[PDB]
Amino acid sequence: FGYWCSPSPEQLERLSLKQLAAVSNFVIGRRGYGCITFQHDVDLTAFTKSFREELFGKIVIFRSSKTVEVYPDEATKPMIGHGLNVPAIITLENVYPVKKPMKDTTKFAEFQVFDRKLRSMREMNYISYNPFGGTWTFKVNHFE
């Protein structure tokens, strides 16, 4: 389904359970949708039954609605600082203003309105937005 991560699931299984509690450089994405780049070590010990099945489209979901969800079950979402509920940089692809998607890049003024909207988001801290592709990069402190 286009999902991927680094370390890859095959690499994560070659770690010990104590190594899996602090995995560095963790990155998970879905091709054609986006990517999450975690800012600090993450604890992946909740997912050992199957990294691929637990993570790819279950715990992490990139949806066709141009958004991303981490721990969709509220009861399972860890405290901030636990698991994957930690700071990250996110890129989402094909994000556009509006009643279909407005992707006419000759319309710079409307794109500018949309861009200021993104810049003003309080939870999703703006990094960049490219109208050519609708590529929105931002930072979050957690996934609450």
mmCIF file with all atom_site columns, C-alpha atoms in Angstrom:
data_model
loop_
_atom_site.group_PDB
_atom_site.id
_atom_site.type_symbol
_atom_site.label_atom_id
_atom_site.label_alt_id
_atom_site.label_comp_id
_atom_site.label_asym_id
_atom_site.label_entity_id
_atom_site.label_seq_id
_atom_site.pdbx_PDB_ins_code
_atom_site.Cartn_x
_atom_site.Cartn_y
_atom_site.Cartn_z
_atom_site.occupancy
_atom_site.B_iso_or_equiv
_atom_site.pdbx_formal_charge
_atom_site.auth_seq_id
_atom_site.auth_comp_id
_atom_site.auth_asym_id
_atom_site.auth_atom_id
_atom_site.pdbx_PDB_model_num
ATOM 1   C CA . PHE A 1 1   ? 0.000   0.000  0.000   1.00 0.00 ? 1   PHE A CA 1
ATOM 2   C CA . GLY A 1 2   ? 3.059   2.321  -0.436  1.00 0.00 ? 2   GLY A CA 1
ATOM 3   C CA . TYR A 1 3   ? 3.967   2.475  3.262   1.00 0.00 ? 3   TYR A CA 1
ATOM 4   C CA . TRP A 1 4   ? 7.628   2.400  4.255   1.00 0.00 ? 4   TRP A CA 1
ATOM 5   C CA . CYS A 1 5   ? 9.890   3.115  7.243   1.00 0.00 ? 5   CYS A CA 1
ATOM 6   C CA . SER A 1 6   ? 13.496  3.451  8.254   1.00 0.00 ? 6   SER A CA 1
ATOM 7   C CA . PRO A 1 7   ? 14.875  1.341  9.930   1.00 0.00 ? 7   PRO A CA 1
ATOM 8   C CA . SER A 1 8   ? 12.803  -0.956 7.765   1.00 0.00 ? 8   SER A CA 1
ATOM 9   C CA . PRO A 1 9   ? 10.637  -3.590 9.409   1.00 0.00 ? 9   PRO A CA 1
ATOM 10  C CA . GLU A 1 10  ? 13.349  -6.252 8.606   1.00 0.00 ? 10  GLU A CA 1
ATOM 11  C CA . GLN A 1 11  ? 15.958  -4.083 10.324  1.00 0.00 ? 11  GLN A CA 1
ATOM 12  C CA . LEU A 1 12  ? 13.747  -3.417 13.347  1.00 0.00 ? 12  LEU A CA 1
ATOM 13  C CA . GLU A 1 13  ? 13.371  -7.179 13.928  1.00 0.00 ? 13  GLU A CA 1
ATOM 14  C CA . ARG A 1 14  ? 17.194  -7.423 14.026  1.00 0.00 ? 14  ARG A CA 1
ATOM 15  C CA . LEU A 1 15  ? 17.212  -5.189 17.145  1.00 0.00 ? 15  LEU A CA 1
ATOM 16  C CA . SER A 1 16  ? 16.825  -6.319 20.788  1.00 0.00 ? 16  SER A CA 1
ATOM 17  C CA . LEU A 1 17  ? 13.817  -5.317 22.827  1.00 0.00 ? 17  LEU A CA 1
ATOM 18  C CA . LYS A 1 18  ? 15.990  -2.841 24.770  1.00 0.00 ? 18  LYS A CA 1
ATOM 19  C CA . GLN A 1 19  ? 17.238  -1.304 21.484  1.00 0.00 ? 19  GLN A CA 1
ATOM 20  C CA . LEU A 1 20  ? 13.646  -1.078 20.272  1.00 0.00 ? 20  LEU A CA 1
ATOM 21  C CA . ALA A 1 21  ? 12.772  1.200  23.233  1.00 0.00 ? 21  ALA A CA 1
ATOM 22  C CA . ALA A 1 22  ? 15.023  3.969  21.804  1.00 0.00 ? 22  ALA A CA 1
ATOM 23  C CA . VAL A 1 23  ? 15.244  3.710  18.019  1.00 0.00 ? 23  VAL A CA 1
ATOM 24  C CA . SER A 1 24  ? 17.131  6.671  16.415  1.00 0.00 ? 24  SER A CA 1
ATOM 25  C CA . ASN A 1 25  ? 16.367  8.325  13.122  1.00 0.00 ? 25  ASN A CA 1
ATOM 26  C CA . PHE A 1 26  ? 12.929  6.821  12.816  1.00 0.00 ? 26  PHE A CA 1
ATOM 27  C CA . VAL A 1 27  ? 11.067  7.787  9.673   1.00 0.00 ? 27  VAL A CA 1
ATOM 28  C CA . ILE A 1 28  ? 7.715   6.443  8.322   1.00 0.00 ? 28  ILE A CA 1
ATOM 29  C CA . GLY A 1 29  ? 5.903   7.471  5.218   1.00 0.00 ? 29  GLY A CA 1
ATOM 30  C CA . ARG A 1 30  ? 3.532   6.470  2.453   1.00 0.00 ? 30  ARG A CA 1
ATOM 31  C CA . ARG A 1 31  ? 4.639   7.054  -1.120  1.00 0.00 ? 31  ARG A CA 1
ATOM 32  C CA . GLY A 1 32  ? 2.469   9.696  -2.777  1.00 0.00 ? 32  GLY A CA 1
ATOM 33  C CA . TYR A 1 33  ? 1.111   10.905 0.538   1.00 0.00 ? 33  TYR A CA 1
ATOM 34  C CA . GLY A 1 34  ? 3.865   12.097 2.862   1.00 0.00 ? 34  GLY A CA 1
ATOM 35  C CA . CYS A 1 35  ? 6.385   11.311 5.556   1.00 0.00 ? 35  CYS A CA 1
ATOM 36  C CA . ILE A 1 36  ? 6.954   11.636 9.320   1.00 0.00 ? 36  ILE A CA 1
ATOM 37  C CA . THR A 1 37  ? 10.550  12.319 10.528  1.00 0.00 ? 37  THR A CA 1
ATOM 38  C CA . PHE A 1 38  ? 10.789  11.856 14.262  1.00 0.00 ? 38  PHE A CA 1
ATOM 39  C CA . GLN A 1 39  ? 12.962  14.395 16.150  1.00 0.00 ? 39  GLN A CA 1
ATOM 40  C CA . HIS A 1 40  ? 14.064  12.190 19.011  1.00 0.00 ? 40  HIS A CA 1
ATOM 41  C CA . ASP A 1 41  ? 14.457  8.449  19.732  1.00 0.00 ? 41  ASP A CA 1
ATOM 42  C CA . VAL A 1 42  ? 11.193  6.535  19.670  1.00 0.00 ? 42  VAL A CA 1
ATOM 43  C CA . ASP A 1 43  ? 9.934   3.426  21.548  1.00 0.00 ? 43  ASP A CA 1
ATOM 44  C CA . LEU A 1 44  ? 8.659   0.859  19.097  1.00 0.00 ? 44  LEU A CA 1
ATOM 45  C CA . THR A 1 45  ? 8.226   -1.979 21.689  1.00 0.00 ? 45  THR A CA 1
ATOM 46  C CA . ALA A 1 46  ? 4.424   -1.924 21.392  1.00 0.00 ? 46  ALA A CA 1
ATOM 47  C CA . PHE A 1 47  ? 4.665   -3.112 17.779  1.00 0.00 ? 47  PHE A CA 1
ATOM 48  C CA . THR A 1 48  ? 6.798   -6.249 17.897  1.00 0.00 ? 48  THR A CA 1
ATOM 49  C CA . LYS A 1 49  ? 3.974   -8.642 16.883  1.00 0.00 ? 49  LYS A CA 1
ATOM 50  C CA . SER A 1 50  ? 4.570   -7.374 13.382  1.00 0.00 ? 50  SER A CA 1
ATOM 51  C CA . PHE A 1 51  ? 6.149   -3.973 12.641  1.00 0.00 ? 51  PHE A CA 1
ATOM 52  C CA . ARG A 1 52  ? 4.746   -3.976 9.134   1.00 0.00 ? 52  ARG A CA 1
ATOM 53  C CA . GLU A 1 53  ? 1.175   -4.896 10.167  1.00 0.00 ? 53  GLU A CA 1
ATOM 54  C CA . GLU A 1 54  ? 1.052   -2.797 13.324  1.00 0.00 ? 54  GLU A CA 1
ATOM 55  C CA . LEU A 1 55  ? 2.526   0.363  11.797  1.00 0.00 ? 55  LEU A CA 1
ATOM 56  C CA . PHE A 1 56  ? 1.575   0.422  8.140   1.00 0.00 ? 56  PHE A CA 1
ATOM 57  C CA . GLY A 1 57  ? -1.998  1.724  7.955   1.00 0.00 ? 57  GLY A CA 1
ATOM 58  C CA . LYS A 1 58  ? -2.983  0.734  11.470  1.00 0.00 ? 58  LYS A CA 1
ATOM 59  C CA . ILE A 1 59  ? -1.048  2.867  13.943  1.00 0.00 ? 59  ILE A CA 1
ATOM 60  C CA . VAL A 1 60  ? 0.093   5.287  11.248  1.00 0.00 ? 60  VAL A CA 1
ATOM 61  C CA . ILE A 1 61  ? -2.422  6.182  8.543   1.00 0.00 ? 61  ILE A CA 1
ATOM 62  C CA . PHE A 1 62  ? -1.860  8.506  5.591   1.00 0.00 ? 62  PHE A CA 1
ATOM 63  C CA . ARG A 1 63  ? -5.318  9.042  4.082   1.00 0.00 ? 63  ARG A CA 1
ATOM 64  C CA . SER A 1 64  ? -6.549  10.099 0.683   1.00 0.00 ? 64  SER A CA 1
ATOM 65  C CA . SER A 1 65  ? -8.055  13.134 2.452   1.00 0.00 ? 65  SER A CA 1
ATOM 66  C CA . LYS A 1 66  ? -4.459  14.496 2.522   1.00 0.00 ? 66  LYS A CA 1
ATOM 67  C CA . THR A 1 67  ? -3.982  14.037 6.183   1.00 0.00 ? 67  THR A CA 1
ATOM 68  C CA . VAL A 1 68  ? -2.080  11.862 8.722   1.00 0.00 ? 68  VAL A CA 1
ATOM 69  C CA . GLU A 1 69  ? -3.176  10.028 11.841  1.00 0.00 ? 69  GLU A CA 1
ATOM 70  C CA . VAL A 1 70  ? -0.978  8.439  14.530  1.00 0.00 ? 70  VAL A CA 1
ATOM 71  C CA . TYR A 1 71  ? -2.747  6.178  17.089  1.00 0.00 ? 71  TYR A CA 1
ATOM 72  C CA . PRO A 1 72  ? -6.316  6.443  15.752  1.00 0.00 ? 72  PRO A CA 1
ATOM 73  C CA . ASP A 1 73  ? -7.621  4.627  18.870  1.00 0.00 ? 73  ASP A CA 1
ATOM 74  C CA . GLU A 1 74  ? -7.760  7.250  21.641  1.00 0.00 ? 74  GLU A CA 1
ATOM 75  C CA . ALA A 1 75  ? -7.533  4.560  24.394  1.00 0.00 ? 75  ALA A CA 1
ATOM 76  C CA . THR A 1 76  ? -4.177  3.347  23.028  1.00 0.00 ? 76  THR A CA 1
ATOM 77  C CA . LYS A 1 77  ? -2.588  6.739  22.421  1.00 0.00 ? 77  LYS A CA 1
ATOM 78  C CA . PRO A 1 78  ? 0.327   6.994  24.874  1.00 0.00 ? 78  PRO A CA 1
ATOM 79  C CA . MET A 1 79  ? 1.151   9.959  27.087  1.00 0.00 ? 79  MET A CA 1
ATOM 80  C CA . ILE A 1 80  ? 3.138   12.661 25.331  1.00 0.00 ? 80  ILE A CA 1
ATOM 81  C CA . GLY A 1 81  ? 6.779   11.518 25.240  1.00 0.00 ? 81  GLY A CA 1
ATOM 82  C CA . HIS A 1 82  ? 5.884   7.846  25.031  1.00 0.00 ? 82  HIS A CA 1
ATOM 83  C CA . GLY A 1 83  ? 5.841   5.613  21.937  1.00 0.00 ? 83  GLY A CA 1
ATOM 84  C CA . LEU A 1 84  ? 5.467   7.630  18.736  1.00 0.00 ? 84  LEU A CA 1
ATOM 85  C CA . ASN A 1 85  ? 3.698   10.473 20.640  1.00 0.00 ? 85  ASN A CA 1
ATOM 86  C CA . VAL A 1 86  ? 6.696   12.720 20.401  1.00 0.00 ? 86  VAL A CA 1
ATOM 87  C CA . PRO A 1 87  ? 8.004   15.663 18.282  1.00 0.00 ? 87  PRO A CA 1
ATOM 88  C CA . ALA A 1 88  ? 8.165   15.182 14.548  1.00 0.00 ? 88  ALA A CA 1
ATOM 89  C CA . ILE A 1 89  ? 8.442   16.921 11.210  1.00 0.00 ? 89  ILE A CA 1
ATOM 90  C CA . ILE A 1 90  ? 5.776   16.038 8.719   1.00 0.00 ? 90  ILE A CA 1
ATOM 91  C CA . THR A 1 91  ? 5.370   16.508 5.002   1.00 0.00 ? 91  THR A CA 1
ATOM 92  C CA . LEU A 1 92  ? 1.986   15.960 3.372   1.00 0.00 ? 92  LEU A CA 1
ATOM 93  C CA . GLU A 1 93  ? 1.595   15.839 -0.401  1.00 0.00 ? 93  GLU A CA 1
ATOM 94  C CA . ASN A 1 94  ? -1.187  17.145 -2.668  1.00 0.00 ? 94  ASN A CA 1
ATOM 95  C CA . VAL A 1 95  ? -2.511  19.591 -0.080  1.00 0.00 ? 95  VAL A CA 1
ATOM 96  C CA . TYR A 1 96  ? -4.466  22.428 -1.749  1.00 0.00 ? 96  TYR A CA 1
ATOM 97  C CA . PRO A 1 97  ? -7.037  25.112 -1.058  1.00 0.00 ? 97  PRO A CA 1
ATOM 98  C CA . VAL A 1 98  ? -10.762 24.594 -2.023  1.00 0.00 ? 98  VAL A CA 1
ATOM 99  C CA . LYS A 1 99  ? -15.638 22.931 -4.418  1.00 0.00 ? 99  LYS A CA 1
ATOM 100 C CA . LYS A 1 100 ? -12.857 20.559 -5.668  1.00 0.00 ? 100 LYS A CA 1
ATOM 101 C CA . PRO A 1 101 ? -9.129  21.038 -4.962  1.00 0.00 ? 101 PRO A CA 1
ATOM 102 C CA . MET A 1 102 ? -7.906  24.387 -6.356  1.00 0.00 ? 102 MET A CA 1
ATOM 103 C CA . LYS A 1 103 ? -4.612  23.363 -8.082  1.00 0.00 ? 103 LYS A CA 1
ATOM 104 C CA . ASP A 1 104 ? -4.363  26.185 -10.622 1.00 0.00 ? 104 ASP A CA 1
ATOM 105 C CA . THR A 1 105 ? -0.950  27.548 -9.822  1.00 0.00 ? 105 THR A CA 1
ATOM 106 C CA . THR A 1 106 ? -1.477  30.629 -12.050 1.00 0.00 ? 106 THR A CA 1
ATOM 107 C CA . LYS A 1 107 ? -3.831  31.742 -9.254  1.00 0.00 ? 107 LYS A CA 1
ATOM 108 C CA . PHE A 1 108 ? -1.043  32.979 -6.961  1.00 0.00 ? 108 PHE A CA 1
ATOM 109 C CA . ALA A 1 109 ? -3.327  35.238 -4.879  1.00 0.00 ? 109 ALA A CA 1
ATOM 110 C CA . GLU A 1 110 ? -5.606  32.383 -3.826  1.00 0.00 ? 110 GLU A CA 1
ATOM 111 C CA . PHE A 1 111 ? -2.562  30.210 -3.061  1.00 0.00 ? 111 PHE A CA 1
ATOM 112 C CA . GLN A 1 112 ? -1.245  33.054 -0.910  1.00 0.00 ? 112 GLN A CA 1
ATOM 113 C CA . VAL A 1 113 ? -4.448  33.136 1.083   1.00 0.00 ? 113 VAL A CA 1
ATOM 114 C CA . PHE A 1 114 ? -4.126  29.377 1.665   1.00 0.00 ? 114 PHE A CA 1
ATOM 115 C CA . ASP A 1 115 ? -0.448  29.721 2.592   1.00 0.00 ? 115 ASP A CA 1
ATOM 116 C CA . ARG A 1 116 ? -1.181  32.351 5.247   1.00 0.00 ? 116 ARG A CA 1
ATOM 117 C CA . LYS A 1 117 ? -3.827  29.950 6.646   1.00 0.00 ? 117 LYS A CA 1
ATOM 118 C CA . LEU A 1 118 ? -1.143  27.253 6.973   1.00 0.00 ? 118 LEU A CA 1
ATOM 119 C CA . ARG A 1 119 ? 1.323   29.729 8.472   1.00 0.00 ? 119 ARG A CA 1
ATOM 120 C CA . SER A 1 120 ? -1.169  30.641 11.171  1.00 0.00 ? 120 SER A CA 1
ATOM 121 C CA . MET A 1 121 ? -1.828  27.060 12.404  1.00 0.00 ? 121 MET A CA 1
ATOM 122 C CA . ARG A 1 122 ? -1.101  26.870 16.112  1.00 0.00 ? 122 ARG A CA 1
ATOM 123 C CA . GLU A 1 123 ? -0.573  23.050 16.436  1.00 0.00 ? 123 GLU A CA 1
ATOM 124 C CA . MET A 1 124 ? 1.039   22.340 13.086  1.00 0.00 ? 124 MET A CA 1
ATOM 125 C CA . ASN A 1 125 ? 4.005   24.714 13.091  1.00 0.00 ? 125 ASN A CA 1
ATOM 126 C CA . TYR A 1 126 ? 4.681   25.846 9.547   1.00 0.00 ? 126 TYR A CA 1
ATOM 127 C CA . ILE A 1 127 ? 7.919   25.088 7.821   1.00 0.00 ? 127 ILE A CA 1
ATOM 128 C CA . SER A 1 128 ? 7.000   25.390 4.142   1.00 0.00 ? 128 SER A CA 1
ATOM 129 C CA . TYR A 1 129 ? 4.320   25.064 1.490   1.00 0.00 ? 129 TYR A CA 1
ATOM 130 C CA . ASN A 1 130 ? 4.985   24.571 -2.219  1.00 0.00 ? 130 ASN A CA 1
ATOM 131 C CA . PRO A 1 131 ? 1.914   25.158 -4.494  1.00 0.00 ? 131 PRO A CA 1
ATOM 132 C CA . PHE A 1 132 ? 3.623   23.116 -7.181  1.00 0.00 ? 132 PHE A CA 1
ATOM 133 C CA . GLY A 1 133 ? 2.619   19.725 -5.774  1.00 0.00 ? 133 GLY A CA 1
ATOM 134 C CA . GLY A 1 134 ? 0.850   21.134 -2.709  1.00 0.00 ? 134 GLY A CA 1
ATOM 135 C CA . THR A 1 135 ? 3.695   20.049 -0.428  1.00 0.00 ? 135 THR A CA 1
ATOM 136 C CA . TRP A 1 136 ? 3.115   21.116 3.186   1.00 0.00 ? 136 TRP A CA 1
ATOM 137 C CA . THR A 1 137 ? 5.914   20.639 5.706   1.00 0.00 ? 137 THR A CA 1
ATOM 138 C CA . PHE A 1 138 ? 5.396   21.381 9.363   1.00 0.00 ? 138 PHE A CA 1
ATOM 139 C CA . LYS A 1 139 ? 6.431   20.420 12.882  1.00 0.00 ? 139 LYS A CA 1
ATOM 140 C CA . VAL A 1 140 ? 4.392   18.930 15.710  1.00 0.00 ? 140 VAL A CA 1
ATOM 141 C CA . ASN A 1 141 ? 5.297   18.439 19.363  1.00 0.00 ? 141 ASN A CA 1
ATOM 142 C CA . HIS A 1 142 ? 3.188   15.251 19.580  1.00 0.00 ? 142 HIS A CA 1
ATOM 143 C CA . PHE A 1 143 ? 0.094   13.749 18.071  1.00 0.00 ? 143 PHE A CA 1
ATOM 144 C CA . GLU A 1 144 ? -2.620  14.757 20.658  1.00 0.00 ? 144 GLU A CA 1
#
